[PDB]
Subunit: 131 residues, 6 copies
Amino acid sequence: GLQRTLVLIKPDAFERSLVAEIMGRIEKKNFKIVSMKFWSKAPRNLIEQHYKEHSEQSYFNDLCDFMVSGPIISIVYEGTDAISKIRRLQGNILTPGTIRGDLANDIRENLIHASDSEDSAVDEISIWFPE
Amino acid sequence: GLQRTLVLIKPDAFERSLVAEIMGRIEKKNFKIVSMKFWSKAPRNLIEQHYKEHSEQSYFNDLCDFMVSGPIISIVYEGTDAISKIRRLQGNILTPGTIRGDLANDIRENLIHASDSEDSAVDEISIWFPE
Amino acid sequence: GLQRTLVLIKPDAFERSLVAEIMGRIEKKNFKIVSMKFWSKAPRNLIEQHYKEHSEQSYFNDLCDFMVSGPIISIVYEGTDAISKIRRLQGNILTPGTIRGDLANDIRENLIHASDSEDSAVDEISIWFPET
Amino acid sequence: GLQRTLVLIKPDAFERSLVAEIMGRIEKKNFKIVSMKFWSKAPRNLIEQHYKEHSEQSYFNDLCDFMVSGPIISIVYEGTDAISKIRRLQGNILTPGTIRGDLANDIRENLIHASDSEDSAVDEISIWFPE
Amino acid sequence: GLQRTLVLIKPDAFERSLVAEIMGRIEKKNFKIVSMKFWSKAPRNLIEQHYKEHSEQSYFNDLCDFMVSGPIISIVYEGTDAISKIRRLQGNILTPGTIRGDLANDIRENLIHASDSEDSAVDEISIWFPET
Amino acid sequence: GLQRTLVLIKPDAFERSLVAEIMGRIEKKNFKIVSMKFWSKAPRNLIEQHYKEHSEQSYFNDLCDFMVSGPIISIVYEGTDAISKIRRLQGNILTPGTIRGDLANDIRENLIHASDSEDSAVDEISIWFPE
Ligand SMILES: O=c1ccn([C@@H]2O[C@H](COP(=O)(O)OP(=O)(O)O)[C@@H](O)[C@H]2O)c(=O)[nH]1
Ligand SMILES: O=c1ccn([C@@H]2O[C@H](COP(=O)(O)OP(=O)(O)O)[C@@H](O)[C@H]2O)c(=O)[nH]1
Ligand SMILES: O=c1ccn([C@@H]2O[C@H](COP(=O)(O)OP(=O)(O)O)[C@@H](O)[C@H]2O)c(=O)[nH]1
Ligand SMILES: O=c1ccn([C@@H]2O[C@H](COP(=O)(O)OP(=O)(O)O)[C@@H](O)[C@H]2O)c(=O)[nH]1
Ligand SMILES: O=c1ccn([C@@H]2O[C@H](COP(=O)(O)OP(=O)(O)O)[C@@H](O)[C@H]2O)c(=O)[nH]1
Ligand SMILES: O=c1ccn([C@@H]2O[C@H](COP(=O)(O)OP(=O)(O)O)[C@@H](O)[C@H]2O)c(=O)[nH]1
Ligand SMILES: [Mg+2]
Ligand SMILES: [Mg+2]
Ligand SMILES: [Mg+2]
Ligand SMILES: [Mg+2]
Ligand SMILES: [Mg+2]
Ligand SMILES: [Mg+2]
């Protein structure tokens, strides 16, 4: 069961003071922080790498600008079935009960990123936590 | 995709002291109050207008009775995709995660009303905020 | 209209201090407590009865050992459609918004039991509150 | 400094649906339930015993009336310095931050009782949990 | 027994999305809303009246500009000893447990106004709800 | 007005899953995270330095053992009057309304450290954040 997954707390969370609300939802589901970094302004290369699959999309530049417009936190979380469960926890802006469902309402500004597969998770954990 | 929708806080919300809890869920999802009005008792006229589409139903008079049995608040909310999102937030007594899902347990006394279409929004806003 | 259903708060709720959290979710949905008992350690035959339909499963022994590993609370809740609505409230660990969806992440240690039918309700009520 | 104290959840807690809110504050401060008992209506005998020290006061019968006007829960709690700490938690309708401070507004209907001394704890526990 | 008092939710509560949080604190203490108005922008003379006793202070102009910088809500609350108890609820930024103690950290932007006496209550109620 | 102060999230917070609850209380008072580190097990020299003034007290060894018995988070917080306000926010295990007042009940295991003066704050910020 045991996996690790990468979470990003996005800048809209810092602006709207939802940082703890978000982290708290994950904690209460019993996932453990295994490593964590605070970035006051994330190095733009890091964000470009992080959203590489998106480099061709029309939202890519606006996206990068946003991800660098305020602080972010990068967290590695550990627990049973972590990648899938934290993804569900993240949710979408349509359906309530989730982080995005309760607290967000934008296609770009949605508070949180969570890895969506075992592969994107190893990759993302290496970008943000090379060590 | 900026919209405006009409929300009623129903008399059972006041009876059960859930007014802030309900307004808070809508506030947390980033919707903004544009107009608001407290009615210690609503004119049955306005209630019957608001529920005109239901005028030929069994529950029609019970519902009107309840709607005037105590205070209500009429709020116009605004934000991206307001009508549909606030409708999901309202949800139903069957789905936990929503206002009715977490807090209500009845076909009639269900805490809240939210416009369900662009047309009923424009119409209901006009009922409650004729000015 | 009105039904009664049986809830068990499991020992992981005590270990994790979530007792109030769970009871509150049911309280905020307007369900009323009609009976309630705190068992610092529930007698094993009560537990085995409660889970009797499960007696031939691979997990049966482990489940009972767990349910006896800490305190539990048994509660009869009353309200409209109590049985099915508290079932929905409990939910499962895959479904955000529910008790298990927000707070549990295990196949066995999942915080709460709730009757799933009218018969299991009637039966489980009698097991934990035989005085009727 | 392990102690045991007796807490009553009063009938106004049930009326106002604050039972979990109250138990939750005591749970969050790390106190553990040692015994608990639900009374749909308490025998006036037990109430009069519990409040024996008040038997000659103006409010004595009103208080007994209220105490039997609806359910109550009697709980024995345990943890370091339980009697005094749970008393502070209970607080009063004047000081926000406590159970009565945040939630109650009356001299009689004040949600909760907590033992105030080592002696009244031993005595009250014996009233409610004679076994 | 019963009193009524005037509460203002200040524009920093809208900016910070704390409107429900603040109103909830007052609601959970069993105070009832008896009147309420949302002002997307309160007329300046209403604000100046409301703070008229403050007209000669160094902060007077800045305060009024602030109070007009966003929406505000005016509310009459009713309950036992409403005036003094909601004052206590509001508290100050030095006192944890109160609205300002937990959520505010500024001399001017402090979320909430509440009447401090029976006379200021009666007067402030008339300013924001002149229809009586 | 503007100061910075050092906060430690102690291991009892990780054990009891109060990490977000604690950080959230500080966030809602409007203080900003300015830097932050997650330590799965803090280097014992760091903790010895951190509690130097205490090196002669009888609790010093038990204290160090505890501070290294689980994870801790070190945070630098910024805001008006930060050192004094976060100290009040931290509080003590007696009086409710605070982090310690609501959530703690031990002389050693009390969830959080907060610097108590402009001097201890520069010092502590340098131990945990040499850069
Ligand atoms: O049209 C879009 C879609 C995506 N995004 C942003 O870029 C990320 C794109 O990844 P994806 O569409 O897969 O969203 P996710 O999987 O994280 O839900 C999202 O988190 C958004 O914040 C955006 O700005 N515009
Ligand atoms: O059988 C019913 C159905 C409706 N209602 C009330 O009338 C409103 C309109 O009914 P509808 O099915 O449209 O509920 P909605 O989900 O739209 O609010 C509901 O909110 C209820 O408060 C009722 O009393 N009995
Ligand atoms: O593989 C399993 C499945 C069940 N359980 C436990 O025993 C109960 C089994 O009943 P069921 O699968 O029907 O779960 P529930 O009805 O409570 O949702 C669960 O709640 C778990 O606590 C278990 O230990 N192992
Ligand atoms: O004037 C009063 C004082 C007391 N009480 C009730 O009787 C209890 C005991 O009074 P006391 O002053 O000891 O209150 P305590 O703070 O100890 O609970 C209180 O909790 C109230 O519920 C009352 O009805 N009227
Ligand atoms: O130096 C000051 C003091 C007051 N205020 C503002 O104006 C009100 C002043 O009234 P008072 O000092 O009596 O505060 P309150 O009675 O609301 O506690 C405060 O709430 C602040 O919003 C200000 O802007 N500067
Ligand atoms: O008798 C004691 C007193 C202190 N402590 C621990 O060591 C720290 C000592 O610092 P101080 O007594 O000044 O506590 P604080 O100022 O942080 O409240 C406390 O946080 C406790 O966690 C302890 O273990 N035993
Ligand atoms: Mg994706
Ligand atoms: Mg409809
Ligand atoms: Mg089953
Ligand atoms: Mg007393
Ligand atoms: Mg004043
Ligand atoms: Mg100190």
